[PDB]
C-alpha cells in the first residue's frame, strides 16, 4: 500500500468507470438509440417517480447542478422528458416523462442487462458488497 | 447472454453507479491538489507526466497505449503541456510518420514536488482502505469488463 499502488489504483478505478460507461454507450447506439450514460441514469429515477422537481434530480444526480441540467436539457430536445412551471410556484420546474420516455423502460433495461451480465461475468455475487463497500469509503 | 447462476441486475447496476460516483468524486477532489498547492498544472497533466518520468522520450504512439484514452485530447493536453514547458515533440529518428515525447527542463524537476503531494493525496483518500482489501479492489476492478 505505497504510493505506487494507490495511484496504481485510482487510475484503474478512473480509467474501469469511464470503460463502462462508454460501453455501455455503444451498445446503446448500437442498438439505435442515441443516448448516454447519464441520460439512462436520470431516465432510471423518473421512471421510479414520475414528476420529480428538477432540484431534487439534480441532488440525486451524482452531478452538480449545472451539468444534470445541461444533460436535462439534452433530454428535453430529444423528446424524453419535458419541463413545466410547477403547479405551486414560479422559478421551480417539475420533470416530466413523455412517452416516448416511457416508452424506453424495457428496452433501455433489456440492453443495460444484457450489458451488466457480460461485464460482471468473472465477479461473483458475494464480491459485490465487498468491492462496493471499499468504493463507499474511498474519500 | 445466459448462465445458470445469474446476479440480480439492481445490484449490479447499484455497483455500476457506486463505481462512477466514486470515480466522479476522486478526480474532483484530486482536481485542486496541485494548483491549490503552488503548482499550476492539472491532474491530466500530471497522470502523463508519471509516464514520462519512467519513460522519458516514449513515442507519442505508446504513451497513447499507455495512457489508453484519444488522441486529440492525449494530443491538446500534450499541446497545452508543450504550451506550459512541460514537454516537447521530437520527430523520431526512426523515421516520421512518428513522433517522440520528452521532458521540458521543467517537467524533470516537477517530478519530487508533484509526486510528494499526489501521495500525501493518495494517503487521505485511501486512509480507511487497509493492506489486504486494495489488492482485492484492484483485481475486482482489474475483472470488470
Known sequence: KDFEKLYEATTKLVSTSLKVKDDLKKMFKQNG???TTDHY???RFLWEQ???SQIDLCEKSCKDKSNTT???DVMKNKGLI???VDVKDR???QIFLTDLGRELE???NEIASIYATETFKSISDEELPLFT???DRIG
Open 82 to 84: 419535458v419541463r413545466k
Open 50 to 52: 414520475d414528476g420529480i
Open 70 to 72: 445541461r444533460i436535462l
Open 33 to 35: 438509440y442515441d443516448i
Open 133 to 135: 463497500d471499499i468504493l
Open 91 to 93: 422559478r421551480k420546474f
Open 41 to 43: 441514469a436520470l431516465l
Open 106 to 108: 424495457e428496452p433501455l
